[PDB]
Amino acid sequence: GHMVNPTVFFDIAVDGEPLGRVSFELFADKVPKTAENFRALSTGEKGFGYKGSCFHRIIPGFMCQGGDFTRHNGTGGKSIYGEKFEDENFILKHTGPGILSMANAGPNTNGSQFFICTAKTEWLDGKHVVFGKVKEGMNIVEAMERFGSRNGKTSKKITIADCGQL
Ligand SMILES: CC(C)[C@H](NC(=O)OC(C)(C)C)C(=O)N[C@H]1Cc2cccc(c2)OCCCCOC(=O)[C@@H]2CCCN(N2)C1=O
DSSP states (O other): OOOOOOEEEEEEEETTEEEEEEEEEEOTTTOHHHHHHHHHHHHTTTSOSSTTOBOOEEETTTEEEEOOTTTSSSSOOOOTTSSOBOOOOOOSOOOSTTEEEEOOSSTTOBOSOEEEESSOOGGGTTTSOEEEEEEEOHHHHHHHHTTOOTTOOOSSOEEEEEEEEO
């Protein structure tokens, strides 16, 4: 039947202690290639993905950034496409907290890194591809955010202990 936008979850831990679950709606109806990359990385079905990775940069009042499952510090990551991939479109905008958007290193350089906004970040519109939004557990993102700092360094280790598709 109709394509239902997928829902994926992250189970977050703080220094190894469970914190809670964040679930996301992925806008496969509007950005199918970008949504599918994140979905498959969340299930691990290609043999790699987000499980066990960390949020390396958290800036209170701005965003939480993760998805570097290869180098754990913001210098790595990889997509499911064998190469960094194009900015699919910029239809969706950075409208407020909970927006899920791709990190990148220039035009058409999407990999696996992403960020969850904790504020409206409209100056990123047309530069970063928005492809989902927090569905449930924004409170867990708010709890994660408290472990960030001005320069983004986290004061405790924030990990994706489990993830997958609901
Ligand atoms: C994803 C990796 C590969 C990539 N690497 C990179 O481009 O490497 C060089 C510079 C070529 C060698 C990167 O880090 N991309 C950054 C660019 C950016 C955007 C906006 C502001 C930035 C940097 O900096 C000011 C505020 C920083 C704290 O916000 C952040 O760090 C942001 C938060 C949104 C997601 N976000 N990171 C990125 O998409």
